[PDB]
Design a protein around this ligand. Structure first.
Ligand SMILES: OC[C@H]1O[C@H](O[C@H]2[C@H](O)[C@@H](O)[C@@H](O)O[C@@H]2CO)[C@H](O)[C@@H](O)[C@@H]1O
Ligand SMILES: OC[C@H]1O[C@H](O[C@H]2[C@H](O)[C@@H](O)[C@@H](O)O[C@@H]2CO)[C@H](O)[C@@H](O)[C@@H]1O
Ligand SMILES: OC[C@H]1O[C@H](O)[C@H](O)[C@@H](O)[C@@H]1O
Ligand SMILES: OC[C@H]1O[C@H](O)[C@H](O)[C@@H](O)[C@@H]1O
Lengths: 636, 636
């Protein structure tokens, strides 16, 4: 058993030399073998790894923890997610730390340590994650990432070079005798033993510009002449609306001169251009895309939004997969015969403009990616990205295969529109991402959340921030909102509390400027901060474990614990909205008992019925006076 | 002849495919083979390289341009520097550009291009440099750099891993058939043909933490126990002044408990610790320092200032060379017998606290580094860094060897104190760095420059900014000072006009926060600027060639040209200071003629005698009225 094999190894390597730095919050209460200098602590990584793996292994019964927890629990439905508390993480960032204990962070240092996040360090953090009250860890893509077309010194986890392989960088040199796939398997075993479920992330529609799939399936990709790389951009039609074009608009679009030049930038796959040349390079050493560019003078194109007139820039680190062998049915009557496969708004949203010939071999591969993870490591659920673009038949196959192996498997839709819950449910999903963080961060918008949640037909991840948005600690009235926002949000109907990595220590710097973000957030840190201006998605970044917001850390732990103490109300009580202009408020009544969630977002204090009151601490008073930006849970 | 060999190769590879992006300012007037899209231009790198090398080769006579220009001119003195105009550059930055023409910069891209600066691109820029009026190019260290203990994704040019080798990264993959040493030699040949002198930079006192010199001379370095790495810092003595300690202070220092713990952190070289082990690893593959740390558990220490109580942080990317075999003479009576070699304020300034046993073999090596460059590539001069710390005998040997080979060779002292000119001259130097940029950027300080320059006994580099200071374009009243400051400065007595790379296009972002810098300068660029927050010394950085300050570019060219038109006055005219509170002014009289340099830094306009007046343009008026922050050169 790998987790035990790793424990055995650590005990073997133990030496007592404390030269590996970790922030004090990473040291568990039971661990005493460490030196403390300058705020941080030093340990023998093997003693820390041995004692924490012991702590974990001692709680194991004698089942096989390499399969989904649902198996050990005998569950046949994804109902468990409704009682879970999720911690979201980009392992590379969550577990990054300068182990030298001085100077600047380095991906790998002279002492032999990998300061970047590893699956082994994610294991060491398990006691910390568990202390937050989380019982499910959601991870951003950990598949092999492409190192081409990067925006910084680190690749985006969404630039997937191989869906079936984990990125070797998650391997930790401390565990030389082990392989990355084994470290991950061990990581999931440790989670399962602790009752923690694992949810991964996949993006079927796209691939890295130099995807490993190119050598054996060069025809599953699109190609353009290198000469056309520099000015390759989505052809605009300013007279038309900013949106995904409909059928009628296509006729207009296809007659525009700029679209016609666009269509002419494409070529046939390298295998169909020079069969002999292909075979030659196809079996050559070096980056496959660099070989194709040099030998054939063609390259995969960068991706771009499927909405016409979208002002966002092209996605240079990814490209689209060829979902159909033929061009979209409704567009064929506008193409010159012999038109090679091309990318345009319609081809991207295959769900709306499909061809008559599905690329079955690709479809099968795609529908076998998650099951490969369920069977190999026993993951418990997954988030599917860009599902809007997938044909219904391909999405159905993908879900059938995972549910076939484990009917308790939770499928999470990357659906930000909380009004699209009905459609997501109809698509086969079990949970929706939603956009609660947008309202939770605005005093003038937070009161809309109660009705929004109540109307859902699927549970949602109740977040106050995600990897793509600004941190809650940087929103207006942050000092108050960093506690008020999660309180109101985590208690909503149909909620699955979500804790974003770093949120628990009041992290300010955003990880990415994706959704609802302002470039000025790039400068919330001090110009003297080693990580000033850096975005975790594209650059090496270490969260501020050495200077955490302890007030937020403590409140979050207590909030999750109290919320769980009353979980039965949230899940089965009768809900009633009591929100007013100045007061966001609602209640849950059950078996004659009732709890009330309240938060004052007005300019003047307000009073409400008392009883036993919680606001971080428990008190008892008949009346509760909520000054502006104060809140409380009232138990009557 | 390498320059011709490279020209031959470019013509061979020429194909006419324009996919290599360069900013329009890089295209010479004579070059027409380029496409222009989105502000930037695209070329076939081989056609650009062929036509520019042709342009250069066509101006060559039939001499050997691989030796110093002084040889071809028959000069026996370094007098030429007094008539020169210097362009200062960090090739890695000056010649960096995203050749894909879209997306984000990459050290090396999928098209096969090296976007980082290369000696081949420095050759292509030669027509541009020449258009500025510069006739000498000064380069920051281009020796092989260490990749350990970096502050960003790029190494500091001062982290010298091998003084005798050029860093392989300056090689350009376009010239596959050539070696880096050949590209550099060719670069210097092209400069010499164009009349441009080459000045390099060396730092004898220090070395990278993992210097290549370690395998054969592990004993030329200091060593400390890894266990002591994290808290290794210069022992403070707050009761003592912030300065380099004198003799008396040493007795106190050596009796402090913290200094005593410091002394105990050191060990003997790995060769003296385990002779057999050394021989084993000494012949192993891998980073020599990583092997030593793992096998012996010791490491070279990071450097630090020789001034006690200095608030600056340790220099983790460099370490000190062992200049003496014994401990400093004046400190021996304070050491425990068997004290291994250690680093302390006194050991660092070997010039002040020397031992009785010079490390002759090291001294010889050091004194052979520059001559290796003179003989191999024919460089014309050099700047020596940290000369304050070198024993007089070692500095004398170093200068004797270069002067022995070429008596016209120019030695530049890294001396910022313009009052230390007499001492620098007495040390054997020919030029001093000085600190004019500090006064030139302050309206309340600029008037002191005239007397300061006049008193010099050696010429100085008249700069308004250097790689270590803020850009002149970010000082107060920048829009005016970016032209007024260089005007006043370039005409000073004993001046050698200095143009900092990027200054010519009004660059704002600093390259380094070294001298006189404020961390807030780190944010002068837009948060949307791809290079926001980056410092060229430690990170990949591309100057803003695509959005240059054309007004500054033009003025600088005209200023250097007019200054040279009157060079005889500056060099041989009689100087007279005429500066007042509100008016910085001075004159040069020669052969009955006189020119006057004037700049109004007051709050009210001022009038002065006219004649033929230059202020960017030539005019003729009997009286000149200088409003605040206006200037003029008056020819009477
Ligand atoms: O490298 C692809 C893409 O990654 C990021 O965007 C992600 C986003 O964070 C996910 O939540 C999901 O929506 O997929 C997106 C891309 O598929 C970066 O923000 C983006 O710049 C980058 O191109
Ligand atoms: O890596 C050494 C050091 O390099 C830089 O400082 C240079 C400085 O720029 C030079 O002008 C000269 O004074 O030598 C210095 C170091 O020898 C960086 O500023 C510094 O952080 C770094 O440690
Ligand atoms: O399966 C992908 C898509 O299916 C449905 O269209 C849902 O409305 C949407 O939320 C989901 O992303
Ligand atoms: O040779 C190194 C040093 O020599 C003299 O001390 C000079 O005063 C100083 O400017 C120089 O740096």
């Amino acid at each position: 058993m790998l987790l035990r094999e790793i424990n055995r190894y650590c005990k073997e390597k133990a030496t007592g030399k404390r030269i590996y730095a970790v922030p004090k919050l990473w040291i568990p209460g039971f661990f005493k073998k460490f030196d403390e200098k300058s705020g941080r602590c030093f340990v023998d990584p093997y003693e820390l790894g041995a004692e924490i793996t012991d702590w974990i292994l001692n709680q194991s019964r004698e089942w096989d923890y390499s399969q989904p927890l649902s198996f050990l629990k005998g569950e046949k439905t994804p109902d468990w997610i409704k009682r879970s508390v999720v911690y979201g993480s980009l392992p590379r960032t969550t577990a990054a730390y300068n182990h030298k204990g001085s100077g600047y962070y380095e991906e790998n240092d002279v002492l032999g340590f990998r300061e970047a996040g590893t699956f082994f360090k994610m294991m060491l953090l398990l006691p910390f994650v568990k202390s937050l009250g989380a019982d499910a860890i959601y991870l951003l893509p950990v598949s092999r990432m492409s190192d081409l077309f990067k925006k910084g010194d680190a690749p985006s986890p969404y630039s997937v070079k191989n869906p079936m392989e984990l990125d070797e960088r998650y391997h930790d040199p401390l565990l030389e005798p082990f392989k990355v796939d084994e470290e991950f398997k061990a990581f999931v075993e440790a989670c399962h033993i602790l009752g923690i479920r694992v949810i991964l992330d996949f993006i079927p529609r796209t691939a890295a510009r130099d995807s490993d799939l190119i050598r054996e399936h060069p025809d599953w990709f699109y190609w353009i002449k290198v000469e056309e790389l520099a000015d390759y951009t989505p052809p605009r039609a300013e007279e038309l609306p900013f949106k995904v074009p409909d059928e009628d608009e296509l006729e207009i679009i296809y007659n525009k001169e700029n679209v016609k030049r666009h269509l002419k930038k494409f070529t046939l796959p390298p295998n169909l251009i020079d069969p002999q040349k292909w075979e030659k390079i196809k079996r050559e050493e070096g980056n496959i895309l660099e070989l194709i560019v040099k030998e054939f003078g063609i390259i995969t194109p960068p991706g771009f939004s499927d909405l016409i007139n979208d002002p966002q820039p092209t996605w240079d680190d990814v490209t689209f997969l060829r979902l159909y062998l033929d061009h979209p049915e409704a567009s064929k009557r506008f193409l010159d015969p012999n038109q090679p496969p091309y990318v345009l708004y319609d081809v991207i949203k295959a769900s709306k403009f499909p061809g008559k010939e599905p690329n079955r071999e690709l479809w099968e591969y795609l529908a076998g990616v998650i099951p490969h993870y369920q069977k190999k490591y026993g993951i418990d659920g997954a988030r599917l990205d860009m599902g809007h673009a997938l044909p219904k038949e391909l999405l159905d196959l993908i879900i059938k295969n995972v549910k076939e192996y484990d009917p308790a498997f939770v499928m999470i839709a990357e659906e930000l529109d909380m009004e699209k819950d009905k459609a997501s449910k109809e698509a086969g999903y079990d949970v929706i991402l939603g956009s609660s963080w947008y309202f939770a961060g605005r005093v003038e918008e937070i009161g809309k959340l109660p009705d929004i949640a109540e109307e859902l037909v699927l549970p949602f991840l109740a977040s106050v921030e995600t990897p793509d948005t600004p941190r809650i600690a940087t929103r207006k009235y942050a000092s108050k909102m960093k506690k008020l926002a999660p309180f109101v949000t985590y208690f909503l109907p149909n909620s699955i509390p979500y804790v974003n990595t770093g949120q628990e220590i009041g992290e300010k710097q955003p990880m990415n400027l994706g959704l609802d973000t302002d470039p000025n957030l790039r400068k919330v840190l001090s110009p003297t901060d080693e990580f000033f201006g850096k975005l975790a998605f594209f650059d090496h970044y270490v969260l501020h474990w050495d200077s955490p917001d302890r007030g937020v850390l403590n409140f979050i732990k207590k909030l999750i614990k109290v919320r769980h103490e009353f979980l039965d109300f949230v899940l089965n009580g009768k809900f009633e909205n009591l929100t007013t202009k100045d007061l966001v408020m609602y209640s849950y009544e059950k078996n004659g008992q009732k709890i009330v969630i309240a938060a004052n977002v007005g300019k003047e204090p307000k009073e409400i019925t008392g009883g036993r009151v919680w606001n971080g601490k428990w008190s008892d008073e008949e009346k509760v006076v909520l000054k502006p930006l104060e809140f409380a849970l009232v138990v009557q």
